[PDB]
A paper describes a structure:
In response, one family of large bacteriophages uses a nucleus-like compartment to protect its replicating genomes by excluding host defence factors. We find that the shell is primarily composed of a single protein, [name], which self-assembles through its extended N and C termini into a closed compartment.
Cryo-EM analysis of the 1.75 MDa assemblies revealed cubic particles approximately 22 nm in diameter, paralleling those formed by 201phi2-1 [name]. We obtained a 4.2 Å-resolution structure of the overall Goslar [name] assembly, and used a similar localized reconstruction procedure as for the 201phi2-1 [name] to obtain a 2.6 Å-resolution structure of the Goslar [name] tetramer, and a 2.3 Å-resolution structure of a single protomer. Overall, Goslar [name] shows high structural homology to 201phi2-1 [name] despite the low overall sequence identity, with a Cɑ r.m.s.d. of 1.8 Å within a protomer and 4.8 Å over an entire C4-symmetric tetramer. We performed cryoFIB–ET on E. coli cells infected with Goslar at mid-infection, followed by subtomogram analysis of phage nuclei. The resulting approximately 30 Å-resolution reconstruction showed high overall similarity to the structure of the 201phi2-1 nuclear shell, with a square grid of 11.5 × 11.5 nm units.
Author numbering:
A (entry chain C), B (entry chain L): 626 to 631
C (entry chain B): 591 to 615
D (entry chain A): 45 to 586
E (entry chain D): 210 to 420
F (entry chain J): 45 to 209
The structure:
Amino acid sequence: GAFNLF
Amino acid sequence: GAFNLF
Amino acid sequence: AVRGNMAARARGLGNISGNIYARSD
Amino acid sequence: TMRTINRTLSRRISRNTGSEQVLNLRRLMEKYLEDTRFKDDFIFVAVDPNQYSVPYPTLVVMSGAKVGDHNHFFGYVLPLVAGLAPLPRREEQGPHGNILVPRTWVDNLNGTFINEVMAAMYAAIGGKSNGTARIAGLAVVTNEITAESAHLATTLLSAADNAIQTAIEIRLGDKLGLPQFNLGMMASDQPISSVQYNTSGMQDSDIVGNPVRSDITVTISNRIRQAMSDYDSQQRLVATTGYIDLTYSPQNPTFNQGPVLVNGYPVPPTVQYQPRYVMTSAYPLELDAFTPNTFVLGLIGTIATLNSGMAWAQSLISNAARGIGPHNPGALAMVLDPEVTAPLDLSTQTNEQIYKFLQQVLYPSLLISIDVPEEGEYSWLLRMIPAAEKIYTGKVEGEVREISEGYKALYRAFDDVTLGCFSKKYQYGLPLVYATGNRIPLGHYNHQDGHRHDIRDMDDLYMMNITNPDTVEAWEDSFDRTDMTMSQRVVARHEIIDRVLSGSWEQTGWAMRYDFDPLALQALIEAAADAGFTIRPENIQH
Amino acid sequence: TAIEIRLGDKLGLPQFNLGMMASDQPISSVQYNTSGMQDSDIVGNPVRSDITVTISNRIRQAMSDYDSQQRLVATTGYIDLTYSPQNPTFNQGPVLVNGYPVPPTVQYQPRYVMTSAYPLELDAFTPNTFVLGLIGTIATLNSGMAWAQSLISNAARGIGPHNPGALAMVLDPEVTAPLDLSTQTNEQIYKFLQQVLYPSLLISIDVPEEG
Amino acid sequence: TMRTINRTLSRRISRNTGSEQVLNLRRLMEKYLEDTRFKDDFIFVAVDPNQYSVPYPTLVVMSGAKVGDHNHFFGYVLPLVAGLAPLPRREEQGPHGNILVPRTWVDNLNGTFINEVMAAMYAAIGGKSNGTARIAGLAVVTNEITAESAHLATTLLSAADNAIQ
C-alpha cells in the first residue's frame, strides 16, 4: 500500500 | 627523486 | 511435502561478458 | 472517557510536559536558509493533530516550478514520532483462528492521511486556482530534535531539495530542457572500482542515524590524469552496501530428471544451498544529484565487480578467519555429515582448502536481490522496482495486450542509460523483476561490543551457529513455504527473534524483498559494453 | 490526595473506579530483563526489577482507522523461594495443590515480591489506582504459568548468582556442584522444575518506612 | 565532461561545502606572531590550484638574510591534504606483463610543482631583481586544521624557523 500511496 | 627535488 | 525453494536455483546469475573489462595496455 | 482523565482528576504540577519538535526543526531550517540566496524558494507547512486529522505532528517542505502560465508545487513530508508510545498489536483472521500481528509507525499512514496533507498544502499556496500540488516523498524521523541539531536539519533539507528537483525534471524535462545522466558522459575517461570486506566494529548509518548492515562495500570512481603536469587524481561517484545470505534448495535426482547443470556443468550430489546477495543501500559520494539513471550506474558497477573472479566468496572466506562465532561458515559441516554435531573451526586452514570445502555444499552462482523500504530517504526513488513487477494490465486489446506504466518506466531507464542498445539486446515484454512475498522488519539492538547493530544480522547462518535445528527448520519454512499468508510469516519470524534476543530490541519500519531476472542482467551488461563503457577493478585478489 | 480523601464529599471531588474503562479495551504486557541497569527511584537509587508489567488502554479512531495506546501504570518485582518441607510421616493426608497431589521430592514454595508501583501518563496516583495496578499484575502473572518464564530465562546465562540449577543439589544429595542448563530446551527445564517446586504463587509486598 | 557534472546537473543545497585550511593556518600563525618582536621577519605565501598548477593547497613560510647589498630568501613548503580522496594505483610495465603499483601523497610532487612554487615565491618578494629564492624544506600535513589548533600551528612555525636558520 505504501508503494501506491502517492 | 624526492632527495634531489630541491 | 518436500521442503526447499525450487525457483531460487533457476534465478542464479552465472557469468557475464568479458567485454565489460578494460583491456591491458 | 479515559482520554480526558487528566482533566477530571487533575494536579497542579505535572512531570510530563511534552516538546515542540515541529517548532524546533522549522526554526533551524529557516535559520540555515536566511543567509543564502534561496530565502524565497521554500515554503514550510505545519500540520498538527489539533486541527487536521493526522496521527503524528508533521512538517511539509514545498517548492514550485512554472511552465507557461501554470504553477506546479511539490512537497516532502516529515512525520516526527520521538516521544510517543509504540503501536499495539492488531488482531487478524486466520485459517485456524485469530492471530495478533505486529505494527510499526508506517502502518498508520493510509489514504486519509494523504488527503489531509493535500488539503493543508492547498491552503498554504492560496487555493486550487493558484496552482497544483503533488507529494514527492516521505520519511519518518525517530530521533529527538533539540536546539542543538543543526547538522540533522541541514541533511534533511538537502534530501528534500534533491527529491523535489528530480520530480520536476522527470515530469517536465522535455518542456523545460533539463538533461539526465547517461553513459555518454563517461566517454573520455577511465572508470574504476574497489571493494572492501569489513565485519568487525561499527556499521554504516542512515540519514537519521541508525545502523545498516554493510558486510560488502563497493565504490565506483573516475580516474583523471593531467596532460602536461602528470598529476594523478580520482573522483568518487557512488557507493553500495550489502551482504551474503543462503537459501535452502535441494536437488531431486529421484524424480527421473536430468542432473542439475550450472554454466553447463554438473555439480556434486551433496550441494544443497544457493548463495544470495542482498543490497541494503546506495547513495552518492561527490555527485550532487541522485536520480534513477545514477542508480542504474551503481547497479552495473556492483554486478561487474562482484563477478570478477568469484570475488563474492571472499566474504565467506574472510568471515571464516575469526573462528567460532555467529558468522562462521563452518556450521555447514553439520549439513554435510549428519553425525557431526558441532560447528567446525577453520581458522587454521589455507584459503584454497576453505574454497575446496565450500565447493562441496554451495552452488557456483549468485542471486541478486534488493530490499525496498516502505518509507525512507530514497523510497521515492526505489519504488519503481515494485511497480515493474506486473507486466500487463488486463485491459482488453484490439490485437496486442496493453503493457503497464511501471514496466515502461523501468525499461525506459535501462534503455536511456545505455543509449538505446538494451532495446536491441532484450525483447520488449520479457520479465525484469520477481516478487518473493516476504516482509522484512527494520530495527536495531545492543551488541556486546558497545555499539548498536542492524536487526538484519539474524539470518540462516546465525541460526545454525547459535540455536538448535528445530529453529533452523522453522526459520527456513517461513521464508519458503507457499501455503502461508504474509501475516503468518511475519508472526513466525517475530516470535523467533523475540525469543532469541529476550525482547531487548526496537523496531522502526518494514521492507519488501525483490530479485532481478538473470537474463535481463546479462543483456544489460552486454548493452553497456556496446555503448563504449569499460571498467577496471583495482582491488581484486587472485 | 489527602485533601480529596478527607473532604471529597463536601468538596465534590470524584475518585477512580472501573466504570471509567467501560467503553475501551484494556491490555497488558510483561518484560523479563536481568542483565544491565535496573530501575531507579525518585532520589536515584537502584530498584530490583526482574519482572515488569505495564497496563495500558487501546484506542481506535472511528472513521480514520488510526491505532494508538495510552499507558497508565507500571509494576516491578522478582521471584524468591521459601523452604517448606512436607511431612508424610505424621500420618496425614498427602499435600494437594488445586486438588492434585505432588511428587514426594517437592520442598520449595515460589514467592512473588512487589518492589514498586508508579504512574506513567496519569497525573494522579491514589489508592484506587494502586488497586487497578494490583488487579492487572495478578491477571498477567497467572496467564499460563507466565511467572516461571523468569526462572527459565535466568537459566539461559549458565553458571552465575541466579542459576536455578543449584536446586540439583537439593534433589540429589551426592551432587555437590550446581548444574548447567544452558543447553536444554524449555520443556526439559520445565520438567526439571516440576520436581522441586510447588505449582502455585505467593503474593507479597515490601512496604518502606519512608519514601 | 565529468569534472563539471555538478554544474550540469545542479542542486540548490549541497551537503559537501569543503573548508579553508590555508586561511585557518595562516590566521593562527599571524595571531601568534602579532605580540612578539618578530612581526616583520616572516612572509606568508598562499598557493592554490585556482591560479597555479599545483595539486594541493599549500602555504609557504619565507624569511630573508642580507649580505653586502644582496638579499637571500628561503622558504618552507606545507601542502595540506586533509579531506581529499586518496591517490589511485598506477599501471607499470614488468618483465612478464603489467602490474598496478600503489602511490601516496608525495608521488605527485615533481619538478612542475617546484617550478610553480618558485614562481609564486618570486612574485611575493617583488621580482628577480629584489633578491634570490631557494627552497629549504617540505612536509605534508595529513590532519585537519580548525580554529582550535593553536598548538599545532606553533609547532609547525618553530620547525620552519629552525630549517631556515
